[PDB]
RNA sequence: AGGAGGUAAAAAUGUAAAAA
RNA sequence: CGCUUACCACUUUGUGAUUCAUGACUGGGGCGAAGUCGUAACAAGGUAACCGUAGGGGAACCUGCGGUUGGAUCACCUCCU
RNA sequence: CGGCCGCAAGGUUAAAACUCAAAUGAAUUGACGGGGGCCCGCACAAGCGGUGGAGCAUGUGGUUUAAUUCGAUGCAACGCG
RNA sequence: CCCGCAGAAGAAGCACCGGCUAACUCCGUGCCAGCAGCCGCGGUAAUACGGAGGGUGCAAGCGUUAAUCGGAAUUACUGGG
């Protein structure tokens, strides 16, 4: 307020933090993908989450989430990664793109098959 | 259960040299009453516990696992002889200790107060469309 | 230099689908570690030393025979240290 | 009805025995 | 033409500045509670609380000094007029 | 952290990573208070007689058993169904 | 571009269906497996997990991801405390 204060120090634009620091303006990224383990979510939920630790192409070791029943990764097999938090397991903020190089689709997903990358069974 | 001291007679090489430090002309001349053994890794008594002595970083044991202990406490050589045999079983039998991992743990009554806690919030969140 | 030989199958009182065996106190492993064995308070071990082994997860009979015996020797090596 | 004095004492936790 | 002189780039040496990786170990923080110790604060929370400061202490915190109200509490018994 | 100041304690200026969908204010209905006021009840007090100690009857837990049927299981289960 | 043969021949999927936000039931699994942008759904009837039927949106495109402005008068000169 009080214009003289304003002309000396302008209106500060709030530089927002990007939620996914994989690489700015980058839709997907691939990784070596090691360390497949399971830890517990927080107070609301109760389960066992299958997560993975990926060595990125630009060299960032972050943890991602394998959305689905289909487990197709063991200490290797390069997969595709997209942004998305699951908010129950704190620390993870990425989704493994189901339908990647070595990550096949999940079986019996007869509804909503674009996600989980399953092609159409002609029968 | 049953455990008995073995110490392979002859399989353990034993040398003898003079002592260090001060102590007149009896410590630099006939001070060969001092020991310095040699327990190669080729000995292998338990065979599988043996490989745990080799990869085990420690002093008084080289890279080839010759296990060299220089005894220097008193004048008597029979004293350092037993003093050494004691430092071996103190080093060897101190690494036999295969501590148990025995894990992990798991909630026993979390769901007994946590699940009931949420179930109490799940019923309160009904304020919306009538 | 201290040859180890934990010879099982001796003075036993193995009672039992899922095992509930006991261990005789008047013998096996002498006074130096026997007092260390008789001075453990974990309420699995009673006030006598006829230890009530309640191994029930290793379903099968012969399996729980040795698993409770495994519960025995593991408890033994801990208390013989 | 205004008014001034004096009058009182220690005591935790809410899985709490039930698992390895 | 050859030679010579001044200038400049790569290269070199020495010494600083800054930045970025990394480093046994170490400080504190967040998060996970499913354990251990205590119960400080929220009622006068059982010693009102908090703020600054100094010292103390396994932990919350304790104590001294000074300050703030973002503190509760006025029942009765003797008596004068 | 760097700068700045300080005998020192430290002060002043002032981050970010990470993490959460909350944190906060006033006020309202309650509820609780080792807060206050008032009042009642075999609540206390004033008394009398009992239980708990003994034996037996009966119910329950535990234990044992081929089965010892099942349910109730602070007050308000336990001479209960 | 026009004339002619032309058997419908050769030509529709995708997401979603708890609220927000248009649209519902049954079955299988039982705080397990899993879903999710936000609040959250799940402990043997799951209008939210999977599948099935039906429905709604959009269409040779439809989703998800990422990024910008918007909503945000949450940098407010217009237009804040």
From Swiss-Prot, chain A:
Effect of residue 42 to R: Confers streptomycin resistance but not hyperaccurate translation
One example of a Gene Ontology biological process annotation: translation
GO molecular function: misfolded RNA binding; rRNA binding; structural constituent of ribosome; tRNA binding
Keyword annotations of the record: Acetylation, Antibiotic resistance, Methylation, Ribonucleoprotein, Ribosomal protein, RNA-binding, rRNA-binding, tRNA-binding
Modified residues (3-methylthioaspartic acid): 88
Taxonomy, superkingdom: Bacteria
Record annotation: effect of changing residue 56 to H: Protein is not incorporated into ribosomes
InterPro entries: NA-bd_OB-fold (IPR012340), Ribosomal_uS12 (IPR006032), Ribosomal_uS12_bac (IPR005679)
Coiled-coil spans in chain: none
GO cellular component, one term: ribosome
Residues with the N6-acetyllysine modification: 107
PANTHER family attached to this UniProt entry: 30S RIBOSOMAL PROTEIN S12 FAMILY MEMBER
Complex formation: Part of the 30S ribosomal subunit. Contacts proteins S8 and S17. Interacts with ArfA. May interact with IF1 in the 30S initiation complex.
HAMAP family reported for this sequence: Ribosomal_uS12_B (MF_00403_B)
Protein role: With S4 and S5 plays an important role in translational accuracy.
Note: At least 19 substitutions or deletions in 11 codons can promote streptomycin resistance, dependence or pseudodependence; all but one of the streptomycin resistant mutations (K42R) are associated with hyperaccurate translation and thus reduced translational efficiency.
Protein family: Belongs to the universal ribosomal protein uS12 family.
Record-given protein name: Small ribosomal subunit protein uS12
Organism: Escherichia coli (strain K12)
UniProtKB/Swiss-Prot annotation, chain B:
Localisation: Cytoplasm
Protein EC: 3.1.1.29
Record-given protein name: Peptidyl-tRNA hydrolase ArfB
GO molecular function: peptidyl-tRNA hydrolase activity; ribosome binding; translation release factor activity
Ranges for region Disordered: 97-130
Domain notes: The unstructured C-terminal region is required for ribosome binding and peptidyl-tRNA hydrolase activity. The C-terminal tail functions as a sensor to discriminate between stalled and actively translating ribosomes by binding in the mRNA entry channel downstream of the A site between the head and shoulder of the 30S subunit. This allows the N-terminal globular domain to sample different conformations, so that its conserved GGQ motif is optimally positioned in the peptidyltransferase center (PTC) to catalyze the hydrolysis of peptidyl-tRNA.
Organism: Escherichia coli (strain K12)
GO process terms (BP): regulation of translation; rescue of stalled ribosome
Encoding gene (name): arfB
UniProtKB/Swiss-Prot annotation, chain C:
GO biological-process terms attached to the record: regulation of translation; rescue of stalled ribosome
GO MF annotation terms: peptidyl-tRNA hydrolase activity; ribosome binding; translation release factor activity
Cellular-component GO terms for this entry: cytoplasm
The enzyme's E.C. designation: 3.1.1.29
The entry's keywords: Cytoplasm, Hydrolase, Translation regulation
Enzyme class: hydrolase
Localization (cell): Cytoplasm
Reactions it catalyzes: an N-acyl-L-alpha-aminoacyl-tRNA + H2O = an N-acyl-L-amino acid + a tRNA + H(+)
Function: Rescues stalled ribosomes. Can hydrolyze peptidyl-tRNA on ribosomes stalled by both non-stop mRNAs and mRNAs that contain rare codon clusters or ribosomes stalled in the middle of mRNA. First identified as a complementary ribosome rescue system when the stalled ribosome cannot be rescued by the SsrA(tmRNA)-SmpB quality control system or the alternative ribosome-rescue factor A (arfA).
Comment block on domains: The unstructured C-terminal region is required for ribosome binding and peptidyl-tRNA hydrolase activity. The C-terminal tail functions as a sensor to discriminate between stalled and actively translating ribosomes by binding in the mRNA entry channel downstream of the A site between the head and shoulder of the 30S subunit. This allows the N-terminal globular domain to sample different conformations, so that its conserved GGQ motif is optimally positioned in the peptidyltransferase center (PTC) to catalyze the hydrolysis of peptidyl-tRNA.
Family of the protein in this entry: Belongs to the prokaryotic/mitochondrial release factor family.
Subunit structure comment from the entry: Associated with 70S ribosomes and polysomes.
Protein name from the UniProt record: Peptidyl-tRNA hydrolase ArfB
Protein's organism: Escherichia coli (strain K12)
First and last residues shown, out of full length: 4 to 100 of 140
